[model samples]
Target: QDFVAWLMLADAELGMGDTTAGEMAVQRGLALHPGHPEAVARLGRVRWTQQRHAEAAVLLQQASDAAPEHPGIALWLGHALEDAGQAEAAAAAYTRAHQLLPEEPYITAQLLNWRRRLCDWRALDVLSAQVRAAVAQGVGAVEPFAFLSEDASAAEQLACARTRAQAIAASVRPLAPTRVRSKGPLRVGFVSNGFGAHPTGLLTVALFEALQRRQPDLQMHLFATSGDDGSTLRTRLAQASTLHDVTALGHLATAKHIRHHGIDLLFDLRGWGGGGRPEVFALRPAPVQVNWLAYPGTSGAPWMDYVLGDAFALPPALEPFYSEHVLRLQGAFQPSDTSRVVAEPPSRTQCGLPEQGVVLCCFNNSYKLNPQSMARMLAVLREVPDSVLWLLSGPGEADARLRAFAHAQGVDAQRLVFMPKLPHPQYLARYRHADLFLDTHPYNAHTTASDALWTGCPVLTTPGETFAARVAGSLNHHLGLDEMNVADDAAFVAKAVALASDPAALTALHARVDVLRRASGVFHMDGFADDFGALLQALARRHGWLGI
Candidate 1:
């Protein structure tokens, strides 16, 4: 009866996307019979689906601990821990799971992703070989490499991206201004989906804040869509600029709204990634449109007349990679959140830590942890015997596979710790517990790096040729931590270990924290806004009816 009732409850909650409720139902079922592995496993699934990674890890671990013979539990636990930021522990879990269930396809994929993030290219090479072998053996749809191949030259990569961009540019119409001109203030519109608590929102906060203070002879219109909650940010935005909740509004309607406002220049925050509204830009809502911040790469839309960049972030040499004529800013492109308060330190006991080993932390999302990267991280752990790899993310079957892969690479399983997702303030505070942060590959750490820096933890990064890989290096360059940006894989591992080994060096590195935050272009919100505004005005003057 208990099992039936629990199953019914789980089905209903799962169907509704109420994972929290599903987890509770499974937990209640498990409470009735502590020996029920299925109930425990179900609970773990529920927690994982809810993004309660830490709890999922514990529950999955408990299930695995109770039934040592069950590889599924261990695999689930490992994945949970990996997401929770306990890479070492996750590795251990994966090892146990792999020993139990050999050559699982899903497990293999998860392991590959984890290793890729660790930058263990040798292991990545091995995995790639295995994938090719599998494909030769008629295994269809082996996940292609996440990043563009290292073998591909910079020109080749750029050429491929350019081809795609050119195709996109061919169809996109340029933004056109209203035919009727008004003598009053110029109506400027900003469009983005990220407007609350996201990196894009945080970076632009100071811009809006400064705009409120400056109160220039211009009307600012913000079109925003996705947000966790709209109340607080909306109120603040309302005080600074005219806020429009375009969550329900479609692309054409949004374009019409901008057209109705007689916006002189429409600033597109979303380019091609992260909830982008290219369709609206395609409709040509404003006389002039510029792309900036949210998406660093080229918009691939001819409508996007200007792409904001910096000398460091987007150099003249790299201009051919972009579709738009780049408008280079003197400094870093965006600002950090000064308004966020630092969070309190988490208890080591709750985090399942020994309270002593060196904690090497990474808070990047699961997708970033490619197979090669995980192997590289394991190699680093092998060199630094006392260090433990910590991870945080959504929990699932992937964790066990990662553990197995790490074990195969000769790293100890017991050295990992997993953490759950928390509120922004609490999440930042958790960094205080870590010794250092290891950034992911291809996709570099942006907001995560900012958060870690704000919490006083240094991030070690390897700058790849692509815009995605170069972010950490660029951020470090702007921050004045040029030394932190290593040119290649060897340099990357060496820098991470060297920094970890030298206390004085790490302390010295910390001293320069404010340089990136203050002097670098990122923190210079007013200057960036001014430069950005000037670029928009220039583009408008050239293309639209704007006389100035």
Candidate 2:
């Protein structure tokens, strides 16, 4: 009886995604049948979902030890190990799993993604081609964002997204909007993990207010992943729109809550990116859904009605590559705060910059540092004497690896100065110290790029074919800063070096940006919101709403 009851409860809790309760039930099961493989895996999976990755890894190890030949158990172990911050070990674990279950591209995909994150590019081309073949054959093993680094064709990107959607079809199929209201305030709901001091928060806190003020006819609601961390924009965000704290809410419940809101449209601020609830989108809680902002890639889901962008980011010619209809903005799709301040900066020496020469920086995440980009950056550094590269710090190992990578290129490790994570305003303020902001690819700097330009730090972008690679170029397009946009590597490196070497040219660009900062559409939230609201009205009209 004890075993029967424990089995029933533990499995139920595990299925419900209440891992804390699931762990206790699993303990109850183990009390009756000690070290049972399934029960152990259940507990391990729970801990894994709860972000207790180390504990999950231990339990998964125990489970794997119990069932030596179980490939599924091994896969869970890889996930736990990776989340535990052991990229190398996770890759090895996935590699071992593939050895046992070699036919599974799912396992291979996990291995590839982690390796890319670790900047381990061994057999990168072969593995990429393998995944590309799998995706084309409708057996997708690569994620959409992961495919960005490969410079995959639009067809491949779309295939990856659609395949991923198919894999999650069960979760979203039931919630497909059965009936959408024919009348409303063109109510729009946003789902995002980035509501607190994150890029989403920093970017949208003002945009939401501007939208309401600009188009009082529209109402906006937010479903934030976690509570705010005492960010400066905390109160202003709450005041801008109705906010829901759904960090504690599970997928189904969150979907139901959104459904209950009677929202006219759902704008997924985070598409298929990490920390986003794509399953909620799958549920189809609202009449219309848009994939926007968070991920600069095609969603490729039939359920998503539109993908928001301007002509530059999602070109009309590239519409076939995406699942959603492209919803172009009047200008660059990004919004910026004109009120953001650049406080008096410390001397170059105080900020760890050299007193004399130019400072070229890319404050993007470390993962964006591909070997190609790094090589270009190194070449630029070599060309410009005494100039330093300022980068934002990543995981402890990221700095060590980057410096080593820099060292291998014959560049002094001291030339790359890493900055600790700081508050938004302070982070923005530091841009004053930089002469030129070097953008990364195939995942270009989004909010980070805006932060640079908004502070009058000139940006240089090399446009590629994909959405992620084109964003900064799009910003440059809208801001009329064409000189900073380049089409190839030679131009990127040459322009960067020339700008660094010639203070007059770089200073002139900065001065021009400073003059256009307030006048530019990229920083004009109130102006952008007018077109955004009109788009909402147009969408409602197209759908034959009773009242828009």
Candidate 3:
């Protein structure tokens, strides 16, 4: 009874998002029964919430040894190992948990994903089959993002989103998007910690500055929940809007602060991703809540009143899959700062690029590249005699893994070149040397695709099933350069090879990109800001935040 009392108190504190209290309560429970499996696992869970992952892994390991059959302990241990970057060990823990409780879909999803991340493609065919089968039978077996490559259909995507949203709803009670009494020239607030030199930070610094300048009635409040890096970019963002460093606040306090600002429309830019403050959104500080940039898929919750999309970012056919109503912009949902100009490019030789051959640029982060994509790229290189692949370095192992992959494919290792991370202007300059931009799949390049196109470089893409896969297609179509959008993997290869072989055709496409970039679409942010402003006022009116 004493054990049960402390166990309940610990769980109660955890469910309330009080990690400190939860840790203390669970410690008390473990003190009562030194080696009790359930209490030990509960304490491990507490340590996990506290982000003491190394300690959590040890606790869960002890818990698992005491009660080998407890799937819950295995699950937490897997999470602990995963956070600690022990991919293989995490996979083993998750696999053990799944073996004990095969019916637990989410656990199986994590297991397969870790295996995917590590490039352990031994069971990929069978795993793909298993993932599809799980989705078809019921409350889908995975997170929607994990399911993207395997089951790209809207139906399965929706099912996966609904399941996740339901799980989050069960844990974090979502407040109704009911009218919150607020007033002003629309107090628009953005909640994100990624407002520094990160991708999200870079994209918005100029857009927010320009938008606030144009829309006098809109009071911009950015709750930069992600800690500041003390860079000029951070300073620029702080000056762009009223910046608050609320990374240290608990979820309850976060929402309380947003409410105090009388925020009319709050955007959850980071949805289900790192630095996301979902519990604050669960509290519903704003009358109209939105899920936008920084994530590709749905917020998967009814609490999100709208999802920001441009006609290209989210297609109408996939609309039903999203929980929120669609609010689309005429141009690409993405914004580009005409102000961020590229510096003069060094010659191909100076940048270590071959002076003669075609260079295929794939700028999306390295984790997005899988074996299948690499094989297809190698195949393209095989067909195009003088072509090479250029990429930015991904995790610690990616550069080596990719070089090894190319060599195994019988291609020259020198054909692969990794770029050092550079400043924004300098990075864009590298695009001038790329013959063509090859987009990644399942998680296609959203901002990167825009970046490539904005640089007057042609982007070749395979428009496919999910929202993540269609971003490049959207940008291409919007830019009137649909000539670059291909159909499938084979098609992508065929097209890339042909473009590389035909210097004239590739040059013409680049020339075409130059002309199209002049259009008042993605290349310019003025139209994007106008449409976004109109959408905000519309949301303000619908939510009665315009003081109806």
Best by lDDT: 2
Report the C-alpha lDDT of model 1 over 1-548, residue by residue, as the tens digit.
56769867887998877877787787778777875777887788787877888888888877787898887787778878887998667766765675676566445545555554443333556555554444344342333233232323335444433444445456666455454243445678888877776666766776787766664755688888764465455456666788787787867788888787787777888655554566788787876677777764666555666677777667777778776777866666655666667877768766766676667888877667766566677777887767888877434444555677678889877666667777666778888787778887766677787778766777888877666667677777777778878777777778777776776776676667745565555666676567666665555556543442
Candidate 1 C-alpha error for residue 439, in Å: 1.8
Check candidate 3 and list the clashing pairs. Answer: 193-226
Can you tell me which runs of candidate 1 are displaced by over 4 Å? 1-184, 227-231, 514-521, 538-548
TM-score of each: 0.69, 0.90, 0.85
Q: Pick the TM-score winner.
A: 2
Residues 385-484 of candidate 2 have per-residue lDDT tens digits of 8889999987536677788888988889989988888877778888889888988877788999999988888889897777888899999988989888
Deviating ranges (above 4 Å) for candidate 3: 1-50, 54-74, 95-103, 132-141, 170-184, 343-356, 396-410, 419-432, 542-548
Clashes of 1: 46
lDDT of each: 0.68, 0.81, 0.78
Predicted structure 2, TM vs. truth: 0.90
Candidate 1, residue 277: Cα displacement in angstroms equals 2.6
For every candidate structure, what is the RMSD over all alpha carbons to the true structure, in angstroms?
10.0, 3.0, 3.8
Candidate 3's residue-wise lDDT over 276-395, tens digit each? 576788788787888887667777776778888877668888898788898887777777656767767889888888998999989876546777677888998999999989888655
Candidates ranked by TM-score: 2, 3, 1
Kindly provide the TM-score of model 3 when superposed on the true structure, using C-alpha atoms: 0.85
